[model samples]
Target: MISLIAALAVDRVIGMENAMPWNLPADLAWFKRNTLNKPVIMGRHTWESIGRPLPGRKNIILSSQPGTDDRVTWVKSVDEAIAACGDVPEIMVIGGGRVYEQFLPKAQKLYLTHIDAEVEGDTHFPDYEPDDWESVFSEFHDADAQNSHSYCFEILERR
Candidate 1:
């Protein structure tokens, strides 16, 4: 299964100048917990924004850019990424706007952290119909000393 993961504000903002707008440690930890051993595919910009290849999981970068690294497996397309995964049961699509748009149609599930507050951002998630998905699970978290804003972890499966 292909799963797209992200934390978005109520306004649908995902990033501001290549960085996350909020500092929600719980959400970050949640992301790490879910994607830890999965084969992760991300856009070039997303890979760069994250600095290093994420540890524990195999990093698959989709880019036509010139840089190369021994730690990451590079590919040019989503099909190629899937092929690279070989026999993994799940592939995680971690993204920037364009990457999410490219794989949203093919994604089987969405792992979203829905932040209650709206923030300004240059990048946003691709729009999808509510009717096409059903919320399979959700867990709410209130703002705390550890977390910046209130948010909910929601898993939506394509209907």
Candidate 2:
């Protein structure tokens, strides 16, 4: 099944200047462990944001353009990405705003870090109502001076 994993603010703001604003060690580790070796699908702009292929995980870039890098596997659709990952159990849909929205329908699980802080962002996470996804697990964290942000880790299983 497809999984969408994103770190967002309380306001659903996810990006600033084309990159994530805060650093969450726990979230990073969780992402690495969960997405490693799986086909991680993302938009071309999202893949370009990293500027290179990520080791361990295969980079599946969704784009209208056909000609793309060899390391970067070009998928015309998110459904293609899901199809390519057949029986793989989990495929990660990493983001820009549009990519996340596109795959939201197929996402079986959501790993979200809801930050208490807010910042101006060009992109935001897709909206989901409580009736849509069921939160199986959640934890609130206190704000630290270093990041100056409080956040909650929510594991939502699509209902």
Candidate 3:
């Protein structure tokens, strides 16, 4: 199955510029643990922001452009990404806005970290309409020494 993974604020803003505005260590840890060793898929800008293929994972950069990075498999579309994933049990769609929107419809499950607060930003997630998906699981974290932002981790399945 394919899953889209991300965290967002009340307005769905994910970044202030090209990077994440808040530092949520717990959320980052969660993402790292879940995504490593999987076929992590992302759009060009998302890949550009990070600028390196994550170690121990097969990075699939989705783009219409031609480029290459070590261990980075480049593809032009969602269909190509899925095809590249082969028979892997799951593939991760990590994102900037465009990729998330493009893959949302194809994702069987979505792993979302819903922040309790909002930040001013341009990059945003697509609307999470209740009619579109059903929340199957949720876990919340509060202000802590490790991170200041409060958020909830959610796993949803298409309705």
TM-scores, all candidates, are: 0.96, 0.89, 0.94
Top lDDT hit: 1
Writing each residue's lDDT as its tens digit, candidate 2 over 1-159 gives: 778988887689989788887787766776788788888988888887879998898888888988458876887876687776667878888897999998888788998888877688889999877798899999887866554677788899988
Ranking by TM-score: 1, 3, 2
Best candidate (score: TM-score): 1
lDDT of 1 by residue, 1-159 (tens): 899999999778999888886789999999999999999999998998999989999999998865489789999878998899889888999998999999999999999999988778999999988999999999998999988789999999999
Cα error, residue 120 of model 2, in Å, equals: 0.3
Error of model 2, residue 115, in angstroms:
1.2
Please identify which of the two predictions, 1 or 3, would achieve the higher TM-score against the true structure.
Answer: 1
Better of 2 and 3 by lDDT: 3
User: Considering TM-score, which of the candidate structures 2 and 3 is the better prediction for this target?
Assistant: 3
Which residue pairs in candidate 1 have backbone atoms (N, alpha carbon, C) closer than 3 angstroms, thus clashing? none
TM-score of model 1 relative to the true fold?
Answer: 0.96
Q: What's the distance in Å from true for residue 3, model 3?
A: 0.6
